[PDB]
Amino acid sequence: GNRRPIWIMGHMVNAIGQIDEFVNLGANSIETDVSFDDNANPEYTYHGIPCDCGRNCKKYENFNDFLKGLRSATTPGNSKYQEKLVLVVFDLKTGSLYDNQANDAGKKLAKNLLQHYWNNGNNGGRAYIVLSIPDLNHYPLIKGFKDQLTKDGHPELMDKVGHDFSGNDDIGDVGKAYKKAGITGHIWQSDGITNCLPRGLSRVNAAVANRDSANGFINKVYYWTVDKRSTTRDALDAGVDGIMTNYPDVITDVLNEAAYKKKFRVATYDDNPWVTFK
Ligand SMILES: NC1(CO)COP(=O)(O)OC1
Ligand SMILES: [Mg+2]
C-alpha cells in the first residue's frame, strides 16, 4: 500500500536559532515548550531543569519573539522559509497555573498566536499547530483558545489547530476528556518518556489500536523521545505517525533504510495532520 507519512518532531526547540538547526537535520516538525506567567499569559519558550539527557535545558525566548521567528520559518517568500517545516507542537507547561486559569491561558495563547504567528491573517505562518496539554483537567484551555480566535474574527484558523494530551493518561480517560471538551477530530496521541529512562510499547500499541479501530478517537500517534535507531524501528514497526527526537538525523537515517523507504515517507504540507492514515 501507500507509504505512511511520518512527522519527525524535533524535541525542545525553544530558541529561534534551533528551528533551522533541527529542520536542517531532517525534522519536518518541532516541539516547543511554553511557560506561563502568573496571569496565564505565555511568557517564555523555556523548559528548564530537569530535561532530556544530553540537552541544554535553558535556551529560551520571549514567547512572542519565538512566534515571530517561527512565522519567518513558515511563511513562503521569507528569507528563512523552511518549506519542510509543517507542524509545531506547543508543549503548554500549565503546571504553574491554577486549574481555573486553563481557559484564560487558552485565550491569551490565541491572542499571541494570532498577533505574532498568524499575523492577524496577513501572510502568516502556514504550519499546522498542536496544542499539547499535560493535564486532562486543563481541557477548558481549548474552548478558551477557540473562543478568543472567534472573538477576534478568525475562527477559520482553528482549521490549522489540533490537540494532544501528553500526560500518559489511560486512553479511555483521554477520550472522556475530549468528550467533555466537545472535541471530535484533529487529535494526536502522545505516548512516551524522557530519553533518560526505558519504556515499553504497551500504551503506544493501545493508542494505535484505538486510532485504527472503526470508532476510535485518535487520528495520529507519536512516540517520544526517541534517540536510537533500534527504538525508531520499533516505533515504526508499531505503526506510529510521529517520532519526537533530539536527533532528527537518526530518525531520517532509519527512514532511508531500504525496507523502511517502502512503508514510510516524510510528511509534507499536503499531508493533512488531522486525517487518520489508511
Ligand atoms: N511534552 C512532552 C511530550 O510531548 C514531554 O515533556 P517535554 O518537555 O520533554 O516535551 C515533550
Ligand atoms: Mg516539551
Swiss-Prot record:
Q: Where in the cell is it found?
A: Secreted
Q: Which InterPro entries match?
A: PLC-like_Pdiesterase_TIM-brl (IPR017946)
Chain positions recorded as Mg(2+) binding sites: E31, D33, D91
Tissues/organs with expression: Expressed by the venom gland.
Q: What does this protein do?
A: Dermonecrotic toxins cleave the phosphodiester linkage between the phosphate and headgroup of certain phospholipids (sphingolipid and lysolipid substrates), forming an alcohol (often choline) and a cyclic phosphate. This toxin acts on sphingomyelin (SM) with high activity. It discriminate between the number of carbon atoms in the substrates, since it prefers SM with six carbons in the fatty acid chain (SM6:0) to other SMs (SM12:0 > SM16:0 > SM18:0 > SM2:0 > SM24:0).
Q: How is this protein's activity kept under control? A: Catalytic activity and hemolysis are inhibited by divalent ion chelators (1,10-phenanthroline, EDTA, and EGTA).
**Which Cys residues form disulphide pairs?**
C51-C57, C53-C196
**Protein name in UniProt:** Dermonecrotic toxin LiSicTox-alphaIA1a
The answer to whether UniProt assigns keyword ATP-binding to this entry is no
GO terms of molecular function: lyase activity; metal ion binding; phosphoric diester hydrolase activity; toxin activity
CDD domains reported for this sequence: GDPD_like_SMaseD_PLD
In the record, the effect of G95A is given as: No or very weak change in catalytic activity on sphingomyelin and lysophosphatidylcholine, and no change in hemolytic, vascular permeability, and dermonecrotic activities
**What catalytic activity does the UniProt entry give for this protein?**
an N-(acyl)-sphingosylphosphocholine = an N-(acyl)-sphingosyl-1,3-cyclic phosphate + choline; an N-(acyl)-sphingosylphosphoethanolamine = an N-(acyl)-sphingosyl-1,3-cyclic phosphate + ethanolamine; a 1-acyl-sn-glycero-3-phosphocholine = a 1-acyl-sn-glycero-2,3-cyclic phosphate + choline; a 1-acyl-sn-glycero-3-phosphoethanolamine = a 1-acyl-sn-glycero-2,3-cyclic phosphate + ethanolamine
**Source taxonomy lineage?**
Eukaryota, Metazoa, Ecdysozoa, Arthropoda, Chelicerata
Which cofactors, by name?
A: Mg(2+)
State how changing W224A affects the protein, per the record. Answer: Moderate decrease of catalytic activity on sphingomyelin and lysophosphatidylcholine, and moderate decrease of hemolytic, vascular permeability, and dermonecrotic activities
